[PDB]
Amino acid sequence: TPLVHVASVEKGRSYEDFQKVYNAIALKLREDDEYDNYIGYGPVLVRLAWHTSGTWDKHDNTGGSYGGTYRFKKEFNDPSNAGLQNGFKFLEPIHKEFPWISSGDLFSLGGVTAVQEMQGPKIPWRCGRVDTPEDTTPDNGRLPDADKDADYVRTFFQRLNMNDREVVALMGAHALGKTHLKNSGYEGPWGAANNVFTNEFYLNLLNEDWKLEKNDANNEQWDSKSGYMMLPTDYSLIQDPKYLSIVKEYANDQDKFFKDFSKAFEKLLENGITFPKDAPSPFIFKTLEEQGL
Ligand code: HEM
């Protein structure tokens, strides 16, 4: 037995309404450019979308993006979510201007908007997540640990119904942003263009010279002399031969990575949700640049 969560469109809303919310998110991303030593909010909004979706458990349909339960203190204060409060704060004035959007739609849309405005692939997005009460908040401990190996990673993502290609594609979002010692016990960026969505994660895995070192929090991480880092779970993608093949494919085909990531990311964000046969089709929002805005 799993719960059923049926998508229900915010009353009377359509594509145009959500493009306006997209636009407000994108404009604030542009405006608040100084955040995190001028990386900007794009990376933390992508991580917020993934962590608010990544609690899902296919076996009983608990967790997931539908209920928007990050707004409750058990989930806000999950140690795995340390740092995401910055993303939530960013989204607060968006929610105040557009109070009709559900929290789950806002957290997932923030992720879509971030990826597209950082020049990533289009991510089709569906509305209709509905806020659920505090007691539906999943317990802490459903997001992955970083200090583990490929077997861990593979098994972990089975709970989110992701296969090896989906796992490797999703991990490419680590092109974005950085680890912050005070949030996670790890420090450093994975690459140079921290706020541009590219296949750089895979090129860096394959092409940098990596050394297993201890950081200031006494945790192991792989460091390169270009000043990049990889988590043990990131590095596992080149230690496992099946993952490694996929890493090589994405390192050598930007388009393929973009298409696979778009599919897996939408999937991640939609897991657990039942869409009525007559629900609207997925929206594909225009970027500001495409709109001349
Ligand atoms: C084995 C799975 C994964 C693990 C262990 C993991 C672990 C981490 C850790 C420890 C950080 C740094 C948090 C910081 O200190 O602020 C991080 C950052 C980040 N992660 Fe992951 N991650 C994984 C999967 C993913 C996936 C699936 C995505 C999205 C598709 C994602 C997107 C990000 C983003 C964009 C950031 C940078 C946030 C920022 O700069 O604020 N991660 N991740």
Measured in Å, residue 47 CA sits from the centre of ligand 1 at: 6
Say how many domains are in the chain: 2
| Residue among 267, 254, 150 nearest 201 (CA) | 254
CA distance 283 to 7: 14
Same domain (yes/no): 98, 154: no
Q: Could you tell me if the CB of 258 is within 6 A of ligand 1?
A: no
Q: Helix 85-97 vs helix 42-53: angle between axes, to the nearest 10 degrees?
A: 90
Residue 158's domain is classified under what CATH number? 1.10.420.10
Question: What are φ and ψ of residue 150, in 5° steps?
Answer: -65, -35
Distances (CA, A) of 14 to 27, 49, 77, 133, 185: 20, 21, 34, 25, 42
Domain extent, residue 30, equals 3-143+265-293
For 204, the token pair is 């860096």
Same domain (yes/no): 97, 125: yes
119: left (phi over 0), alpha (psi -120 to 50) or beta: left
Measured in Å, residue 20 CA sits from the centre of ligand 1 at: 28
- Among candidate residues 51, 56, 125, 222, the one labeled active-site is 51
Measured in Å, residue 228 CA sits from the centre of ligand 1 at: 15
Kind of pairing between the strands at 188-189 and 210-214: unpaired
Is 190 known to be catalytic?
yes
| Residue among 84, 85, 119, 94 nearest 18 (CA) | 94
SS3 category, 181:
helix
Q: Could you tell me if the CB of 180 is within 6 A of ligand 1?
A: yes
Cβ–Cβ contacts within 10 Å for residue 51, how many? 22
Question: What are φ and ψ of residue 146, in 5° steps?
Answer: -100, -15
Same domain (yes/no): 120, 150: no
Same domain (yes/no): 249, 153: yes
What technique solved it? X-ray
In terms of Cβ atoms closer than 10 Å to its own Cβ (0-12, 13-18, 19+), residue 249 is middle
Contacts of 182 (CB under 8 A, 6+ apart): 82
Question: What are φ and ψ of residue 261, in 5° steps?
Answer: -65, -45
Q: Could you tell me if the CB of 243 is within 6 A of ligand 1?
A: no
Instruction: Tell the residue nearest (CA) to atom 38 of ligand 1.
Output: 44
Q: Could you tell me if the CB of 86 is within 6 A of ligand 1?
A: no
What spatial distance separates the first Cα and last Cα of the chain, rounded to whole Å? 47
Same domain (yes/no): 64, 15: yes
Question: What are φ and ψ of residue 283, in 5° steps?
Answer: -85, 140
Same domain (yes/no): 136, 159: no
Residue 128's domain is classified under what CATH number? 1.10.520.10
Q: How many distinct helices (H) and strands (E) make up the chain?
A: 14, 5
Question: What are φ and ψ of residue 222, in 5° steps?
Answer: -95, 130
Same domain (yes/no): 113, 162: no
Same domain (yes/no): 293, 253: no
Closest atom of ligand 1 to CA, residue 176? 35
CA distance 165 to 16: 34
Same domain (yes/no): 244, 290: no
CA distance 43 to 235: 20
Contacts of 51 (CB under 8 A, 6+ apart): 70, 80, 81, 84, 143
CA distance 231 to 188: 10
For 191, the token pair is 């690459």
Same domain (yes/no): 139, 19: yes
CA distance 160 to 138: 14
Same domain (yes/no): 33, 130: yes
Cβ–Cβ contacts within 10 Å for residue 293, how many? 11
Please name every residue paired with 222 in a beta bridge, in sequence order, or none if there are none. 212, 230
Please name every residue paired with 212 in a beta bridge, in sequence order, or none if there are none. 222
Instruction: Tell the residue nearest (CA) to atom 23 of ligand 1.
Output: 171
Q: Could you tell me if the CB of 47 is within 6 A of ligand 1?
A: yes
CA distance 174 to 66: 24
Question: What are φ and ψ of residue 57, in 5° steps?
Answer: -125, 110
For 159, the token pair is 């709970």
Same domain (yes/no): 136, 276: yes
**HSE value, Cβ hemisphere, 13 Å, CA-based, for 221:** 25
Q: Helix 254-270 vs helix 42-53: angle between axes, to the nearest 10 degrees?
A: 50
